[PDB]
Amino acid sequence: PLMGGFGLKHPPPQILIKNTPVPADPPTTFSQAKLASFITQYSTGQVSVEIEWELQKENSKRWNPEIQYTSNYYKSTNVDFAVNTEGTYSEPRPIGTRYLTRNL
Amino acid sequence: PLMGGFGLKHPPPQILIKNTPVPADPPTTFSQAKLASFITQYSTGQVSVEIEWELQKENSKRWNPEIQYTSNYYKSTNVDFAVNTEGTYSEPRPIGTRYLTRNL
Amino acid sequence: PLMGGFGLKHPPPQILIKNTPVPADPPTTFSQAKLASFITQYSTGQVSVEIEWELQKENSKRWNPEIQYTSNYYKSTNVDFAVNTEGTYSEPRPIGTRYLTRNL
């Protein structure tokens, strides 16, 4: 896939979820039409997901140090990747997956 | 120890090595004094050492990224921690052991 | 520890507790932002703790009487370490742990 990530011929199956509609008072006298009056409703809950990954371990004889993803050592007004005064979580920058080096 | 490193009450035993002195021609007529004429000599060889270390693995729940020791991303006239044009291996800077963080 | 009490290299683990936030009505039309409207909530309950102590028993040959922590024998307007007319529990004075005597 162009955006990246693993193309799958049978991806993780998507999940669809809906409240069961609960109709308001139907009339006393029967009528053909479907019930257009519903009880306003919404639900909540906790959803959990694990994804078990396989890591390809790295064995490399390169002498000098690699490049590593490291946080800024200099003082800052607020910590990156963490909440600010308002309670607003802010990811400052994108994080690539390529740092370690290998021989073409 | 002030310089750092593990103080040991029975350190790794030091190793002493010397050529066996091989005397030049002694005189035909015996004389009391020790032989002062030796055959100029030196030896060479290959020495190997392993040191089996125990690592204390790191388990930490800190959310935001750590600090990491990383090589300079910007172009340079010659690679650090590696030989230069003359064949001279040069370590540019000292490397501390403290980067990962922990709660006091 | 300076304040006193047992210093522990692995103290009793602290316990953290929170209500699960229950969001109010989300809008009919989806929107990116997190839900800022929550249902005002608080919980109650009963918490119990035992701490099993070991006492170091006291064996001492001192002839004359010791010093002991004793309540005031003289009449008072209200009992110490017990509620007053308003229902206010009031501890009058601090209670040290040292009374029994021992040879240095």
Q: How was this structure determined?
A: cryo-EM
Q: Which chains touch A (3 or more CB pairs under 8 A)?
A: B, C
C78 touches C85 (CB < 8 A): yes
A23 touches A35 (CB < 8 A): yes
Q: What share of chain C is helix, strand, coil (3-state, %, to 5)?
A: 0, 5, 95
Q: Where are the beta strands (DSSP E) in chain A?
A: 82-83, 89-90
CB < 8 Å to A44, chain C: 22-23
Q: What is the DSSP letter of B78?
A: S
Question: Which residue, among B65, B92, B71, has the nearest Cα to A72 in the 3D structure?
Answer: B65
Contact A65 B63 (CB under 8 A): no
Using CA atoms, how far apart are residues B36 and C103, in angstroms rounded to an integer?
74
CA B12 from chain center: how many Å? 14
Q: Which residue bears the tokens 């005031």?
A: C72
A19 touches A40 (CB < 8 A): no
With 0-12 / 13-18 / 19 or more C-beta atoms within 10 angstroms meaning exposed / middle / buried, residue B66 is: middle
Which two three-digit tokens encode residue C55? 């006492």
Contact B70 A71 (CB under 8 A): no
Q: Which is it for the CA torsion C27, C30, C35, C39, positive or negative?
A: positive
Chain A nearest CA to B47, separation (Å): 21
**Candidates A40, A44, A46; nearest CB to C23:** A44
**Chain A residue with minimum CA distance to B83:** A64
Using CA atoms, how far apart are residues A43 and C37, in angstroms rounded to an integer?
14
CA B13 from chain center: how many Å? 15
**Candidates A67, A80, A82; nearest CB to B71:** A67
Half-sphere exposure for A59 (CA within 13 Å, toward CB): 2
Using CA atoms, how far apart are residues A62 and B82, in angstroms rounded to an integer?
11
Which two three-digit tokens encode residue B36? 């002062």
Dihedral angle of Cα B49, B93, B104, A92, to the nearest 10 degrees = -120
Question: Which residue, among C16, C18, C19, C36, has the nearest Cα to C27 in the 3D structure?
Answer: C36
A20 touches A34 (CB < 8 A): no
SS3 C24: coil
Using CA atoms, how far apart are residues B99 and C14, in angstroms rounded to an integer?
27
CB < 8 Å to A63, chain B: 81-82
Q: Residue A40: CB partners within 8 Å, gap ≥ 6?
A: C25
B57: left (phi over 0), alpha (psi -120 to 50) or beta: beta
Q: Where are the beta strands (DSSP E) in C1-104?
A: 82-83, 89-90
* Radius of gyration of the CA atoms of chain C, in A: 26
Backbone angles phi, psi at C45, to 5 degrees: 175, 180
Please tell me what resolution, in angstroms, this structure has.
3.4
Q: What is the DSSP letter of B81?
A: T
Using CA atoms, how far apart are residues A42 and A19, in angstroms rounded to an integer?
7
Using CA atoms, how far apart are residues B14 and B4, in angstroms rounded to an integer?
19
Using CA atoms, how far apart are residues B27 and B24, in angstroms rounded to an integer?
10
Q: Where are the beta strands (DSSP E) in chain B?
A: 82-83, 89-90
SS3 C7: coil
Provide the residue type at B12 as one letter. Answer: P
Using CA atoms, how far apart are residues C83 and B79, in angstroms rounded to an integer?
78
Selected for mutation to probe chain C from A44, A48, A86, A90 (highest C CB count within 10 Å) is: A44
SS3 B73: coil
